[PDB]
Amino acid sequence: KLLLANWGLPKAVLEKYHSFGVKKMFEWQAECLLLGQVLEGKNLVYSAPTSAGKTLVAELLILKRVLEMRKKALFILPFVSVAKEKKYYLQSLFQEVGIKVDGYMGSTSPSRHFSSLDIAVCTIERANGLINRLIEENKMDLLGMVVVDELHMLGDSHRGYLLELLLTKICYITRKSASSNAVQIVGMSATLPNLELVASWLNAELYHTDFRPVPLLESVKVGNSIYDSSMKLVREFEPMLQVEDHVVSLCYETICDNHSVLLFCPSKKWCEKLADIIAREFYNLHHQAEQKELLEVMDQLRRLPSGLDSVLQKTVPWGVAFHHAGLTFEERDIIEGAFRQGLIRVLAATSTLSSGVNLPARRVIIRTPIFGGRPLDILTYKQMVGRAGRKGVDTVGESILICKNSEKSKGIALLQGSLKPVRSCLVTGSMIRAILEIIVGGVASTSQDMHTYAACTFLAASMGAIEACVMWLLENEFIQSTEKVYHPTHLGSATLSSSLSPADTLDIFADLQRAMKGFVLENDLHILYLVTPMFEDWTTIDWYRFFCLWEKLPTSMKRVAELVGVEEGFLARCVKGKQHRQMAIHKRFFTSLVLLDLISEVPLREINQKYGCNRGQIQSLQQSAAVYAGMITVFSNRLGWHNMELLLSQFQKRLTFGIQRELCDLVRVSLLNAQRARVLYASGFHTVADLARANIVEVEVILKNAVPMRTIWVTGRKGLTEREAAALIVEEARMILQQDL
């Protein structure tokens, strides 16, 4: 019984599991699976440590549900990168058996329509939109089971409220059908204290385990000594070589042990400085003053669109690297990818790596309990350390939080502390969309039945203004009042389809309708101004730098700014010598200026020297602004503005890839991001139709040139050789031509 072979799974999936090394099934997962009536369809929510293999139970459940009853399934994952990684893993797992998978990661959308799809692995922001679309045309029968991850974020978070709304909509739908269950919900979480309340809200039984494949022991240092969590001295520290912080010694213990070490840093500048220090201290500690494959990783970064960074030069050919938010989205995967293989030994990361892809390491070191001027949160601290200890390789994993003076008292509190219990975050802006998602889909019409929906949410299960909040929608024309029975309006139905927050729509509707008065078409700026999402905190603005850029703007672009509220007289003028809606317009204009250079295919390095914002915040904005163009276009489609939908139709593809209008068709191949299509375009190939018929040997030479054996890189499959990738360029083009016709 304690073997995967005894459990029922297709053969191909099983041999795929041997390919990944997972040959022993833990007792906790099997016991939780046999526990209760989970198999026959009743929902479940469970918790486990991150390194224990939380995904195994979800994968077995989705397999069994798909094979038992023919019904499509979902995969809700927090971030885009983890979503793409899980998409590729699931695809490699599911190729042979027949359950095709394809993902909805923000900007990117499937070529095939959903009813053909089976497992739609997707982020929350578009999982909610897909659920709304399915609930729209009474087509919820295809859904058979839904996977959610990290249930702890539905509380105080920017996007978890979408997850809670989607879950409560599913619960409301299945409880309406009772007038065993239509749709399964499975989930994984951290060591949540109130997970029973969460489990009871979805009438699921609770199973909580703390079992770990390898032991984990935290440690806190006091000067030149190491203290355990429970006021215990487990080891006496003694630095070997160094030239109270004694940073190199802790990593130096790992190097002589032949194991990897993860050393995260508070802020952006700390990662570069710390990475150089360890690389600098490797000059004399190992030279008295895998190389071949390490140079290949360095060779990978040489002709990346952003090139190879200066600080990355002095560290990479020594086993030391660093990885933060400011790096390019392509160098982030290379550094992470080779870390899995073990080429790099030291990483200087920020807190963003905590929530990303699994990065196993034997020793994890945290710089300060203070992260960015604020104390470290307990929730991210559990997954801060959870990566320590490789499965089946390392028998002991440890974490060494570094504290000084009086900060030790604050630091030790995290070791004995527990992550805060979840909330519901539900006037409230996250509840306005909650009732708009149900009364516009037509499932709930009578007000009394709507009151039962508020009895099905997380707020109700935890243990007035709900009825006072539909009046807020009544004021803003979102709903028409009839005999009470509520019916959606043109604005109400357009917001739901495009999946925008009703708070933002009121401004957009009055902003998009102000393009009726006057529009410019010589330059893409005004079109881009209506697709720039917001400012958030994507970068720090440079006003004097904006002044020099403001003057040098040609005549055509300056016409746009005056038309949207930006003032030539006041722009980088009063801020130097010293309005919230006015302030959010000027940043909106700067966001549109940056995006226009992105869609002009200007070098990413050149934008840094000109725009002051580095490549890390650029792709974190063009990916976020590409989703916005995909929501404005749908918003204008349902609102009956056929002319505006025409202009913004092509701007989702342009912002995602930073391409021009010419390369829109070439880029449809997944292996041509932004430069593999430009150099290919100059080779006389202007469309994907005739690129599919290209000579295989012809594309090899053209791809060799334009340089700013597995040395060429493609997202999702790590590195590749030039001969194979060039063959993949044509091979992908073969499959596109007949699959869409």
54 is in an annotated binding site: yes
Give the C-alpha separation, 533 to 218, whole Å: 42
What whole-number distance in Å separates Cα of residue 737 and Cα of residue 140? 31
Of 144, 139, 135, nearest to 165 (Cα)? 135
177 is in an annotated binding site: no
- Whether residue 213 contacts residue 51, with contact meaning beta carbons closer than 8 Å, is answered with yes
Q: Which two tokens stand for residue 261?
A: 């070490």
* Cβ atoms of residues 400 and 365 within 8 Å: yes
Mode of pairing for the β-strands spanning 712-713 and 719-720? antiparallel
Q: How many residues does the chain have?
A: 741
Q: List, as one string, the DSSP characters of 358-409.
A: ---BSEEEE--SEETTEEPPHHHHHHHHTTBS-TTT-S-EEEEE---TTHHH
The structure tokens 């989930």 sit at: 187
> Cα–Cα distance between 495 and 478 in angstroms, integer?
9
48 is in an annotated binding site: yes
Tell me the helix, strand and coil percentages in the chain, rounded to 5: 50, 10, 40
**Amino acid (one-letter) located at 214:** V
**For residue 271, what are its two tokens?**
């990662």
d(CA 531, CA 536): 14
Q: Do 427 and 248 form a contact (C-beta atoms < 8 A)?
A: no
Give the type of residue at 150.
Answer: E
Contact at 8 Å (CB) between 281 and 247? no
375 has which bridge partners?
Answer: 370
Resolution (A): 3.5
Q: Is 29 annotated as a binding residue?
A: yes
Structure-block tokens of residue 442: 């037509």
Q: What is the rounded CA–CA span in Å between residue 618 and residue 596?
A: 12
Query: Backbone phi, then psi, for 106, in 5-degree steps?
Result: 55, -110
Helix, strand, or coil here: 263?
strand
Annotated binding residue at 53?
Answer: yes
β-sheet with 233-235: strand ranges across: 233-235, 226-227, 216-221, 397-401, 363-366, 261-264, 346-349, 320-323
What is the signed CA dihedral for 88, 92, 96, 101, rounded to 10 degrees?
A: -10
Q: Is 123 helix (H, G, I), strand (E, B) or coil?
A: strand
The CA distance from 504 to 523, in Å, is: 26
447-454 and 466-475 helices, crossing angle to 10°: 120
* CA dihedral sign, ordered 306, 311, 316, 317: positive
- Determine how many CB atoms are found less than 10 A away from the CB of residue 328: 21
* 466 Cβ contact partners less than 8 Å away, ≥ 6 residues apart: 431, 435, 450, 451, 454
Give CA–CA dist 367/101, Å, rounded: 40
In angstroms, the Cα distances linking 183 to 41, 143, 175 are: 8, 6, 11
**Cβ–Cβ < 8 Å for 426, 393:** no
**Angle 105-106-110 from CA coordinates, rounded to 5°:** 60
Reference 85, options 359, 401, 294; nearest CA is 359
Instruction: Count other C-beta atoms under 10 Å from residue 222's C-beta.
Output: 14
Using a 10 angstrom Cβ sphere, with 0-12 exposed, 13-18 middle and 19 or more buried, the burial of residue 392 is: exposed
Residue with tokens 């958030």: 536
> What's the CA gap between 723 and 704, in Å, rounded?
10
CA distances, 329 to each of 82, 333, 615 (Å): 13, 7, 8
User: Is 266 one of the annotated binding-site residues?
Assistant: no
CB of 345 closer than 8 Å to CB of 294 = no
Q: What CA–CA distances, in Å, run from 451 to 3, 20, 240, 614? A: 48, 49, 68, 49
Core vs surface per residue 662-686: b (16+ CB within 10 A) or e = ebbbbbbbebbbbbbbbebbeeebe
Residue 101 pairs in a beta bridge with 119
SS3 564: helix
50 is in an annotated binding site: yes
In angstroms, the CA 387 to CA 339 distance is 13
The amino acid at residue 724 is: E
CB 214 within 8 A of CB 395: yes
Residue whose tokens read 């139905």: 493
CB 355 within 8 A of CB 79: yes
What are the phi and psi torsion angles at 533 (to 5°)? -60, -65
Helix (H) or strand (E) holding 143: strand 143-149
Residue 51 Cα distances to 206, 313, 390, 410, angstroms: 20, 32, 8, 26
Sign of the four-CA dihedral 658, 662, 667, 673: negative
Three-state SS for 284? helix
182 is in an annotated binding site: no
Torsion (CA) 38, 40, 42, 44 in degrees, nearest 10: 20
Residue 153: strand, helix, or coil: helix
Secondary structure (3-state) at 114:
coil
